[PDB]
Scaffold this active site. Structure first.
Site, PDB file in Angstrom:
ATOM      1  CG  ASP A  35      -1.841   1.175   1.297  1.00 54.47           C
ATOM      2  OD1 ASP A  35      -1.975   1.887   0.278  1.00 54.47           O
ATOM      3  OD2 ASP A  35      -2.442   1.381   2.386  1.00 54.47           O
ATOM      4  CB  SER A 199      -2.111  14.220 -13.530  1.00 56.95           C
ATOM      5  OG  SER A 199      -2.541  14.025 -14.859  1.00 56.95           O
TER       6      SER A 199
END
EC number: 3.4.23.22
Length: 330
Positions: A35, A199
């Site tokens: 994770d 992004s």
């Protein structure tokens, strides 16, 4: 040193991925959910409340000759999906794919929430975010990657998750045969303890690319892609009959649909998520309403590049002094 381990979807939907991890002496192998959105290595154990164990493999520290109670240390964690666990702490030898760390904090669960109990395939979590998020008190502990870093050939790990197929986590090296083209690297903020990046935009199917900054985290421990409501609405508007359902808890779409791809930007590069990766199947057995793999982050507080996005790329988690993320097509 290096390590290399195969990671395997737990079910036919890629709801999560499990990676075998050797703990203790002699080794006890547990299948852990790696994770990158948390920083605790915790396991089902001989200390876990018996009614909360249903099929998991447990770590028994009393059978490990290298286990030592970390006296006074406790841990307690709550995840973004509302699940939780807590317990005490041992140090022990932990190996992943041939890479060994001695003295790793292994957090032994005394309690786990119902979602963990109900998933017999996940024996615990192995956190790979920054150690500043580790919950051990009163002495915070380092992640497996942080402890291994100095010994690694290169201070990196990579995630290469499969679509409906196994993939690989590598530590200490970049397998140049595992991706196509070049790796594009992008800056990371560690201020929230996550692999947080920006992004450069998105496209829906064959549509034109929209340049827009989307701050989010690379999180292998989250199944889906969670993005701003504007972006998600633009995606689902291209699917006839798709709608957001409050009763179901997100966007659903007719199972008869063919989904468009979704592209996200990494600098000047582009990662394309095929439409099939966005289908999470019937909302309940036999339903013709299917659950979407792109959902709104509006109720979270952060955008999450989860497995739906990450499995479309070869992803480099660069833990150099100034960390960065790298993405390649594959």
């Amino acid at each position: 040193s290096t390590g290399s381990a195969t990671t395997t979807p737990i079910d036919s939907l890629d709801d999560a991925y499990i990676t075998p991890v050797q703990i203790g002496t002699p080794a006890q192998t547990l299948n852990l959910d790696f994770d990158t959105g948390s920083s605790d290595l915790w396991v089902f154990s001989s200390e876990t409340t018996a009614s909360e164990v249903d099929g998991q493999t447990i770590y028994t520290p009393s059978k490990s000759t290298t286990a030592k109670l970390l006296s006074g240390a406790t841990w307690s964690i709550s995840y973004g999906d509302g699940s939780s666990s807590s317990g005490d702490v041992y140090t022990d030898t932990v190996s992943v794919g041939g890479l060994t760390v001695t003295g790793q904090a292994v957090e032994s669960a005394k309690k786990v929430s119902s979602s963990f109990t109900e998933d017999s395939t996940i024996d615990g979590l192995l956190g790979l975010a920054f150690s500043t998020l580790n919950t051990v008190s009163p002495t915070q502990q380092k992640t497996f990657f942080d402890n291994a870093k100095a010994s690694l050939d290169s201070p990196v790990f990579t995630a290469d998750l499969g679509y409906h197929a196994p993939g690989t986590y590598n530590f200490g090296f970049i397998d140049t045969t595992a991706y196509t083209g070049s790796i594009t690297y992008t800056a990371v903020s560690t201020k929230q303890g996550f692999w947080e990046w920006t992004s450069t935009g998105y496209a829906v199917g064959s549509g034109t690319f929209k340049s827009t900054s989307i701050d989010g985290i690379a999180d292998t421990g989250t199944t889906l892609l969670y993005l701003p409501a504007t972006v998600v609405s633009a995606y689902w508007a291209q699917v006839s009959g798709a709608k957001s359902s409050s009763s179901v808890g997100g966007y659903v779409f007719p199972c008869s649909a063919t989904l468009p791809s979704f592209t996200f930007g990494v600098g000047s590069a582009r990662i394309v998520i095929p439409g099939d990766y966005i289908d999470f199947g019937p909302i309940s057995t036999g339903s013709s309403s299917c659950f979407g793999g792109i959902q709104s982050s509006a109720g979270i507080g952060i955008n999450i590049f989860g497995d739906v996005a990450l499995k479309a790329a070869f992803v480099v988690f660069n833990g150099a002094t100034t960390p960065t993320l790298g993405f390649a097509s594959k």
